[PDB]
Amino acid sequence: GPHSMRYFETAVSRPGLEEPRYISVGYVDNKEFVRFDSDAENPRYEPRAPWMEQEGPEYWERETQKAKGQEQWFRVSLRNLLGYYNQSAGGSHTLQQMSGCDLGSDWRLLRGYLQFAYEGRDYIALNEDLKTWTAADMAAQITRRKWEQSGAAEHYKAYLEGECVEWLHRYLKNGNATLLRTDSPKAHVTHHPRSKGEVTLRCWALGFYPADITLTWQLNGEELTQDMELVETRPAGDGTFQKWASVVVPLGKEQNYTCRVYHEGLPEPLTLRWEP
């Protein structure tokens, strides 16, 4: 499977005396491993994964120093964006960033990425070539000119192709067993009487990890994709996930319906029906 590292940043301006709140979250293969929050007692990058606890004090100090600088960068950028959009003071504004790299199974760099959004809308992004910018609106063109004239794309490409790939290699070794953990789903069917001589059959998948799962209902073979009701995958809060899928079936015909659960933790997909 492919690997990745991403940093998700957010700076939220606040009305009043308090400076903007700055949060930086790191992800390795979509799992949170580090977090910095400027609204903490002693703001610092903290481990969020067990395998990050292997890092020496020099690592945390250097990462914390970078974040303190970035909180100031996000502060000035929010000030510049307010002026570009000719916006009123005393408001609350959001600047977000996503950046990182994707690696192949052979640890080859597939792609690097960098994108920003202002007030929830795409603002500027680095193109796949990592040399040119795609600015979404009029104000973003002011940023593009400033960044082409400073050579910003060269500095991001150097990080995305270099340090990003190097640190991801190092994180992948340090936490191979942790990342490869699986919790298999426990499944059961519930019967919910309705009017018109019909029944809702609900297939539940509980306590599974990772989140990715497929729930299928079938009638004498052949999927029921059309009228099946699904719920979005939900965290149980203990590190595992939950999902259910349901179908409305006629009374007395419930044993013709079968539910299947597909998950990477399973030796084979689960097959189940309403047990009266």
Binding site: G69, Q70, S77, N80, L81, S99, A152
Partner: peptide, 9 residues
């Protein structure tokens, strides 16, 4: 490890 932005928006 995180990256550092240089020129502002």
């Amino acid at each position: 490890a995180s990256n550092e932005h240089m020129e502002t928006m």
